[PDB]
Symmetry: D4
Subunit: 136 residues, 8 copies
């Protein structure tokens, strides 16, 4: 019935409970599946024109099968951008790769009220590089 | 420094760490602010045409200030609709009322392919009903 | 020695650690077996004339074998009816169905004095509804 | 909004988060109020004609204001009686004392099926005796 | 080689992680083996001349192999005797019973001074009584 | 009501929750007062003729007022002496000149059966040395 | 006198429990002071010639007063450089900045042998940037 | 995937999760491998000329493979030396003849500012002595 971390990750299409990802903007995140359909990790935004680039912010969400959603609040020790984003989407095998198709909403303060900017990210699974040394 | 539950709730616009809400469809949810910008609670969906209606599903998200994001996976002990939804939005006063303006995304399995349906929910704060009795 | 969740669930008569139930009134609850004979879940009361209807309230109890007891306090973020109810009873097959035969007591505030109302609920196990989709 | 252990105990009518009690049969229990309306402790049954007399069994329940319910499974390391009892009731000041009026149901295995035996216990608060020595 | 609860209990000479015991005075206790050599449980003193008889008091201690030590502070919700006792000893076969042979020290306040009383309790293992009705 | 760590320490006659001690043989220990009468720490045995000397072994016990009991199992990652000891005793406080008078029992394997050796240690409180460099 | 997070951070010379830092190479880290002298956080290496650049790696360590030590294992979901680094050093005013002066050792596999590289990083405290829109 | 405690130890070259060590100066420590690359334990400093000798101080660090880093803050309940040290190094394993080659840095208060002393320790693994009595 209830999914373990590994089974939840396998049902999403990934071997490991920890998984590294990059999107089309070069933005990166780590996804960690846990108990009760949970998802945790960290997101680094490298999207052109976005404040709060280049440092990690925590993410939390939930998953079932190929489907996922997660949110990031743009708050950490380095920089706050007074906004939060949630992604929702699904996972598919796209060759020997694994991708995630998502759409996202970013809620933030505009000139006269709150606004919500929409977008779309496609994430690509990154194989853990076992380098064998820290030289080069 | 960092936001306590009461502080986080206050910053969002609500006097108490737990809060009940209802949207335009009669959908209901409870929101509980915790530490490190966390958000948890339960969602009961009463949206016309939606397949997992009437029972509570866990939600989890994050907040900062007036801004919020959260996710429900459509899986509990009563019913599974093989899908997840994420909401993102902001609080704002509408008189002595408090509302949450959100846009949402629902990722689910279509005929051949993953699909993302989109929409908007507005939530209105519901004061804890204080009866002296369970009799009518 | 001591009962694990799955073991405790099995001994009670149910194949899975989480289970959904409905009584004669359409009242619903979820039951989750844990360690040390524990029982937890949520109750939604739809009993005619009852003042805290339609929303979930936490329950907690204990089990051994076919036998169970649990309590709900009529307090959540939506509504408070200044009362608590305890159920006690046993599981028994009724064909391929599983039922819980319970008697209950509700302690509440009357006109001058604390009062205890009594009754009987029968619960019937509800199989997890497995849709491929949230669309209809 | 949410009650602390002390406030929950005060709302029940007792100074301390821990409280000792004796009923009309000389049965004894300890009540420990916790967070989220919780109640834990231990029950020793000295009721004429009951197996499982004279050792403590854990209790769990919930409370709001003067109202309480809690259950005991007749299982511990000393003796199992394959049954569980839940009490429900209310607290009142009865002179300088504090009492609890409860009714209870005991679910157990009868000769041809499950049965539920009802009863009534009145518990009296016992002041912690500070003896000042273990001699006499 | 770090011991599990079952392994620790088995090395002490009992089949199970929880065990019930009785000493020469009718005093009773429950022993629970944990991780890191740990021991917890509950003690009921029915020794002639001791205050603080007839109610359970937490115990805590450690074990290695056949050897054990544990302490009870004479403080619970019912009564405080402003004193503590420690037991130290060993398990041994006495026929097909299992016993624990122990010496004990009780520290308490005398007429002018701290004092330490000493003696020996021998404990015999009690099989869990499976009565399978609470009738008798 | 319940005793806090600081309160439990102050009652015992020491101004901090963590405290350092040495006995007549130069054996040393640290005592950490916690919730629920609890006591934990480490013991370093420098007693002539004892086999498990010079390394720290965990202790646990309980306290009330100026009374205390604790045990040490003679098992850690350096050496095992297949034995356990418990101390019971009382504190005697004049300012920062604080002593614990104790008696102890050592249970171990003799040549033909279990045996218990008795002894007395006097512990004296060591004021934390605040040296401001590791240099000499 | 046992230090709280805020007290520990203040003794190190930073206002807050979390802090962001940058070293002479553009490497970045986040420091989080906890209880029991503890330190945790995340490190991003942008040092010239180092593998495992540009992603966050957990750190952990301890502190007393102005003094700190911490370790990073070069392993995360993105990349493993089969090596670990520790930093040790002290905080000092440099103008109205706050710096940490540190020496470090990196242990890694060389052509035949374990090897240890050494150097110095100086870290400067970065104020949290409150941008209050994610635009730019 | 993620490394278990046992796996992390085996990778480091030691057969148990808890392990005892001694360096050239007779300083001793215990190393405990846990989840997430984590390392904890205690360090006893017997180095000539060092101010915080003969008592255990906590360590924490991280490991990957045969590489390790850990720090000790020179603060405990016996003595504070207002300084911290970190070791980094690698294990060298031939059967049960296992060594850790390390280098260390000691940060402390000099006469005019912070200073960092460097050194090298070689640790050698000590096989847990299984002595079967505390007697000699």
């Amino acid at each position: 019935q209830d999914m373990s971390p590994r089974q939840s990750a396998e049902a999403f299409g990934v071997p490991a409970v920890s998984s590294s990802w990059v999107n089309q903007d070069g933005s990166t995140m780590t996804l960690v599946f846990g108990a009760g359909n949970s998802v945790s990790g960290f997101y680094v935004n490298n999207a052109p024109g976005f404040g709060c680039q280049g440092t990690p912010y925590p993410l939390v969400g939930l998953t079932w099968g190929n489907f996922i959603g997660f949110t990031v609040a743009w708050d950490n020790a380095t920089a706050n951008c007074n906004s939060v984003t949630s992604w929702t989407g699904f996972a598919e095998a796209a060759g020997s790769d694994v991708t995630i198709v998502t759409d996202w909403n970013l809620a933030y303060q505009g000139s006269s009220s709150g606004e919500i900017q929409q977008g779309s990210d496609t994430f690509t699974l990154v194989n853990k590089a076992m380098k064998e040394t820290p030289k080069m």
